[PDB]
Each structure stands twice: as C-alpha cells, then as structure tokens.
Amino acid sequence: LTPNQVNDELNKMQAFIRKEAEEKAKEIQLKADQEYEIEKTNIVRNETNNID
Amino acid sequence: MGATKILMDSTHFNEIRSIIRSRSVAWDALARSEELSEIDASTAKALESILVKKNVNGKTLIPLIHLLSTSDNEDCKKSVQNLIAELLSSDKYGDDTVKFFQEDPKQLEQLFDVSLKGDFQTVLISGFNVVSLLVQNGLHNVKLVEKLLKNNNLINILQNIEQMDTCYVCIRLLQELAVIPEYRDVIWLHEKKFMPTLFKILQRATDSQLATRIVATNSNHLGIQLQYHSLLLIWLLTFNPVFANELVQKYLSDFLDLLKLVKITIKEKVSRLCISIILQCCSTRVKQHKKVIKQLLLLGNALPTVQSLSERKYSDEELRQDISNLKEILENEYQELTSFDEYVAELDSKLLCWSPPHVDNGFWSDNIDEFKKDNYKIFRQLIELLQAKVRNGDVNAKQEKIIIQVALNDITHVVELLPESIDVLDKTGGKADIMELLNHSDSRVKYEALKATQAIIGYTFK
Amino acid sequence: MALVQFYIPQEISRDSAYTLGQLGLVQFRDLNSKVRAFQRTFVNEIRRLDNVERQYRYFYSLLKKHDIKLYEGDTDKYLDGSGELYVPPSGSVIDDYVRNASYLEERLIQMEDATDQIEVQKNDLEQYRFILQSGD
Amino acid sequence: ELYAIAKELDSWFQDVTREKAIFEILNKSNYDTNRKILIAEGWIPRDELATLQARLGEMIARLGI
Amino acid sequence: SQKNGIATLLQAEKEAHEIVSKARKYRQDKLKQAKTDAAKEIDSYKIQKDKELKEF
C-alpha cells in the first residue's frame, strides 16, 4: 500500500530475477562446456584409434 | 587486470567481508604493540587508503603477503587478507594486484600458507583468494587443492552446518574449482568426508517446512543457492563415467533421496540438478549402466517417481528434457533386459523386487509358454521358494515379507493367465500357504493371495 | 513472511489492496503475468489441472465405491480447525496427491471387483449346493 | 482399505480444490490473460496468512505459501 | 511508482531472458567450436605420428 514498499519489492524481485538468470546462464554454460569436452574427447579417441 | 566475479554475488562472503572490514583494527597500533611489522602496517594502511579513495598499487601487496605468511596473528592476517581479497575480487580497482599475483609464482604459494591457519574467516578468504588465482588460465596446481582439502581446518568449516556462510563458501569454492578438468580428479579422491553433508543439507531441507522465511535449508535465496551449489558440486563431478557408477553404487541410498527434493521443492533449480544428476548417471556413457539402472529401478523405483515428477512443468525446460530422456532411457533400459533370465536369476537368487515391466501380464504370458519344460518347473520352483520361505524361517517377517508378497503378486498374474497352475501348487503344497497367509499380518500380501485364491476360485467353479 | 498471490483486474486493484490491507497484507504492488516466471502462461498448469480433474474423478469414484454420501469440501482457509489440519500453509503438490490416490483407487476397484466376483461365486455355489444335493 | 482411504479421500478433495484454485490463479490459458491481467504479490505473516484466507472476497483468490 | 515497476520488471525479465539466450548461444558455440576442435586435436596427433615415424 505504501509507495516505497513497491519500489523495494520491485528491486528485490529484479535482483532475484537477475540472480536466477545468472544461475541459469552459469548452469547452461557449465553443461555446454561439459558436453563440448565429452564430444571433443570422443572425437579425439575416434581419430586416435585409426591414427594408431 | 580484470579478475573474474567468482564469489561476488554471494551475500555470505560479503557479510563476513563487511563484518571484518567494519571492525578493522589499526596496523600502526598493532605494530607499536609488538604484534606486526611497521612496514606491513604502513603498506596495508597505504593500500587501504589507496583502495577506497584511489580505486604502483600492486607493489604494496608483497609486504602484506609476506607478513601474512611470516606472522601468526589472525587479526592482522584477516584484515590484510580482507583488503587483498576485496581488491582482487573487485573488477573496477586493484587491477595491478591480479597481474602482480599472476606474474609472480611465489605469491601463490605465499598466499596459500595463510589458508588453514588462523581464524576461520581468514582461511575462508584465503581459500577463495587461492581459488581465484588457481582458477585463472595462467597458473594451476592440484597440490594446493589436494593439500587444502586434506587439511582439517578447511574441511572442518565446511563440515559444520551451523554456519551457512562457511559451508556455502566452501561448497561454492569446491564447486567453482570442480569446473576445471584437473581439479575433478583430485576432488574425487577426497570426496569421502564432505559428501555426507550435502545429502544431509538436502534431507534437512526436505524434512523442514517450505512456508518459513528462515534461510537455512528453506526455499529462500540462501537455501536455494546453497542446495543448488551443493547439488551442482556433485553434478559437475558427475560427468565422469567411473565416478557416476561408483557414486551410484556406493551412495545409491543417499542418491535415492534426491528425487523427493524435486517433487517436494517448488523451484526448478534444485529439481533441474536433481533430475540432471540421475539423468547423467542414467546415460549410456559409464561402464555397467544397465546394472545401475536395474539396481536403481528395482531397489530404488525411480521410474514411477519420475512419471509423477514429470507432471510438474516450469521454466528451464532442459531439465524437463533430461527428465524425459531419463524416463525414456530408464524405460528402454528396463525393457531391454531379458525377462526369462532375469526372472530365473531372481528366483535362483532368492530375492524378489517389483518393477514396471516385471509386473506386466505380457511378460508372464510370454514366459508361461517358455517356462513349461518340466510341467511348470519354474512356477513350482517359485511356489517352492515362497512355500519354503513362508513355511520355515520366520515367515511374515522383514526378509521373507517382500519375497512373499512379490511372489504372491507375481503368482497372481500367472494364476490368472493360465488355469493349469493349480496342479503345480497342489503338487508342491503351496495352496495352503495362500490360505494360511490370507488370515495373518501383511494384509497387502493377504490381498494378493486373496486375489490369487479368488482367481483360482473363479476357475474352480463357474 | 509467507508469499501471497492474488488474481484480479487492474481497475479493482485499489479496492482489493484496501480490503486486503485490513487483514494483515502489506507491500502490495501490482505486476503482470509476464514479469513473474513462475506465474507465466504454460500448458503445465493445464496438464496439472487435468490431473487434478482426474484426481477429483477418482475421489468421486472412491466415494461411490466406498458406499458413502458425497462429501463437499472446498475449504482453503486456515482459521478453522479442520481447515488448518486438512490444508497445509505451504504449497500444494499435485503429483504426490494424484500418485498417492491413483494406486489406492485402482487397488480399491480391483478389491471391489474381486469381492463382487467372490460374493457372486459364493452365492452361486451356495444357491446350487442344495439343488445339487436334492438332485443327487 | 475403505477405512484407510476414507480420510485420505476427504483430504484429497480439499487439497484438490486449492490445487484447482492455484491452477486457476496461475493463468494457464489465453482467456485468463485477457480477463485477469493483474497479478500482484506481497509479504504477509504466517499467522496472518490463515486469517487472510478466511475472507473469500469478490474476484481475488488467495494462495498459501 | 506503481506503473513503473511492471515495465522495469518486464525489462529486467527481458534482460534475464536475453542473458539466458546468450548462455544458450555460448553453449551451442562451445560444441560448434569443439566440432572443429576434434579434427584440430587429431591433426596434432597425426603430425606427432609422422614425426615419430620419421625418427624410426
């Protein structure tokens, strides 16, 4: 009902949304790095067999 | 210049950094009191005066780094480590400190001496300061992370669940250090003492109510970040095939409780990592995935809870794709096994367990024709096992109660599918065991034996 | 503090905030559905409403199979004694509620069919027993 | 079985009513977006949450958290 | 400022959705770089095999 409580709740909601977006971006980056590392390792072994 | 923002969005490290920075003692008074060097106090006062007002500055970090390793006072090492951690953690000021620390290799070993020594706050700031220099692409060392994890002061603060700042800072430092491929090998060797606190935090969060505003293990910003970092620390090391089968084989009991956290929780962060851990362990990349999926499906029964957890949908739909891939991989892996060799091996092993595909009428109807080679020798062996376990061995107990109800429920579908199974039960003597077990305890097994006796009674009189 | 969510038009937000403010509600701020990630439009709420309708049909099927009168609840307030015990203050989980009642409804239907078949077979055999003895 | 599930059916109906009210308050359809476009949030106490849900109001719905 | 927090929260949600889309784009770019990184890591092993065969 107060005017400052809407700005404080909007700032806390924006900070929570920014923290959730940063956590989702960090988890997506970690999963993409793990999948790229697994695919690079599989391709590296798949070339290393015929090279050997 | 341009240090990473790791440990810069957590209020737990900023609360201890603001609490230590609010009560910073004078280095000149401690130097006059015979507690520290005068050059380290004047250099720390010049760096503290040039950090706030000003932010050449990196040259004064060597006297505080040498004074922190030479001295043994946690009051000066905590204030100097908070000032060096505040300049190294920031990205607007203190750019020469990261270049001077990364350029000098002796500063990493000199800064690592303060970790595990003194107060818990100075060891927590020194562990994050050593983890920030170890996380860079210019210097790396597994002996510092292995020696820091082998210490008692570092694991003692993270093992305590009373302080969420030290446990969240240690789990966040181990989870941030676990992103590197070199630290994942050394982190998996020392993961035999701190692993039980992560399951105890999720069990304490699931055991508590979600309508409270206390951020310990609840649905607040601190509890979701602590449980998300604790689940992300095992989720980062869960990408290995040997660690997934070894962690699923050793910690399958504690790993089976992670499915209830996604259903009991309302946020998709813990449910995405909880379903992502079982989806990563259920992937066909580790050795003996069918044994872990068969042991978790038969013993754990994660396949029926995955269908109930799949009904809830929210944002971050990649966790829902991991739940659909885990449900399809669990359903395909469970249906891909032989029912005759699994049923004969389970009957010969003297252990019965329920499953989604084992309780189907098509498997009993298909195995009823192949089982007929000795006049129902398989059904007579299962009825001889249920009558042997129920007759002698404290029947209606803990051990024989699962195989009695599973043998009665499995025998009910075989009795309903074929009307010729009454001769196998009458020849062995298992017909009286259903009538005697129908009027005792275990009323679910009495309902299964009452369903088999009603199925035999339906074919006995028409 | 417990989080509260309200749904109404934007024209009556002043009267809803004034009427809700007299009960203990504070920090009332109007927002939109797109601003809230959890309160956004999705088909998961429609599928959960379909599962809640299947659980409501299973409750009527269990009430009809139980041989009792139709009970009418709809209580959501925590001020009453039965409403506080039958309704928790936290969020509702439809997965444990549907999965906890589906196997009980299927086992109750199978137990009712087995009891009806056993009663019909016992009534048929007891009816034909004296006719078979008198005919024999 | 009936004595074991008789209270669970009555509790499941009351939980299903608030579960349907939360789904209707969630705005999971296109008609609910063009009808109830205002969604506000606020901080209320745990003891006052039971007293706030006692009044049904006119068009506003309450959800416990 | 009742009518400003909805637009500010919508702009913050659009910035968070753009950050999540940038994280998904970097996640696809990691495998897109690893797809060339596999043959780029195999060529250094083939050249090391030829360098190990030239000594024999």
Query: What gap in Å lies between CA B193 and CA B102, rounded to an integer?
Result: 32
DSSP-assigned letter for residue B26? P
Contact flag B316-A24 (C-beta cutoff 8 Å): yes
Query: What gap in Å lies between CA B372 and CA B385, rounded to an integer?
Result: 18
Question: DSSP string of B156-224?
Answer: HHHH-SS-HHHHHHHHHHHHHHTTSHHHHHHHHHSTTSSHHHHHHHHHHHHHS-SS---TTTSSSHHHH
Nearest-CB residue to E45 (from A17, A36, A47) = A47
Contact flag A14-E9 (C-beta cutoff 8 Å): yes
Name the amino acid, one letter, at D4: A
Longest alpha-carbon distance in chain D: 46
CA distances from B269 to A22, B164, B289, C27 (A): 12, 19, 26, 27
Question: Which residues on chain B are in Cβ contact (under 8 Å) with C98?
Answer: 308, 311
Count the neighbouring beta carbons within 10 Å of the beta carbon of residue B103: 12
Longest alpha-carbon distance in chain A: 74
Q: Give the dihedral sign, CA B121/B123/B126/B132.
A: negative
DSSP helix/strand/coil, B226: helix
Place of tokens 């008692």: B152
User: Residue B3: which residues within 8 A CB-CB, separation 6 or more?
Assistant: B88, B89, B90, B91, B94, B95, B98, B132
Helix axes B164-177, B152-159, angle to 10 degrees: 120
Chain A residue closest in CA terms to D43: A9
Check whether domain B12-340 has CATH 3.40.366.10, yes or no = no
Would you list the domain boundaries of chain B? 12-340, 341-460
CA angle B245, B250, B255 (to 5 degrees): 85
Query: What gap in Å lies between CA B386 and CA B401, rounded to an integer?
Result: 10
Q: What is the Cα gyration radius of chain E? A: 24
Query: What gap in Å lies between CA E37 and CA E40, rounded to an integer?
Result: 5
Question: Which residues on chain C are in Cβ contact (under 8 Å) with A8?
Answer: 27
Q: Nearest-CA distance from C25 to chain B in Å? A: 16
Contact flag C34-E2 (C-beta cutoff 8 Å): no
Query: What gap in Å lies between CA B396 and CA B439, rounded to an integer?
Result: 11
The resolution in angstroms reads 7.6
Nearest-CB residue to A23 (from B228, B239, B285) = B228
| 3.30.9.10, 1.25.40.150, 2.130.10.10, 1.10.10.10: CATH of B341-460 | 1.25.40.150
Query: What gap in Å lies between CA B342 and CA B327, rounded to an integer?
Result: 21
For the record, the structure tokens of D24 come out as 């209707």
Question: Which residues on chain A are in Cβ contact (under 8 Å) with E15?
Answer: 18, 21
DSSP-assigned letter for residue B118? S
Task: List the beta bridge partners of residue C4.
Answer: D42
CA distances from B383 to A11, B164, B255, B391, B432 (A): 68, 55, 35, 11, 11
Count the neighbouring beta carbons within 10 Å of the beta carbon of residue C74: 11
Query: What gap in Å lies between CA D9 and CA C101, rounded to an integer?
Result: 8
Task: Looking at A1-52, list the stretches that DSSP marks H as alpha helix, in order from N- to C-terminal side.
Answer: 3-51
Query: What gap in Å lies between CA B128 and CA B85, rounded to an integer?
Result: 8
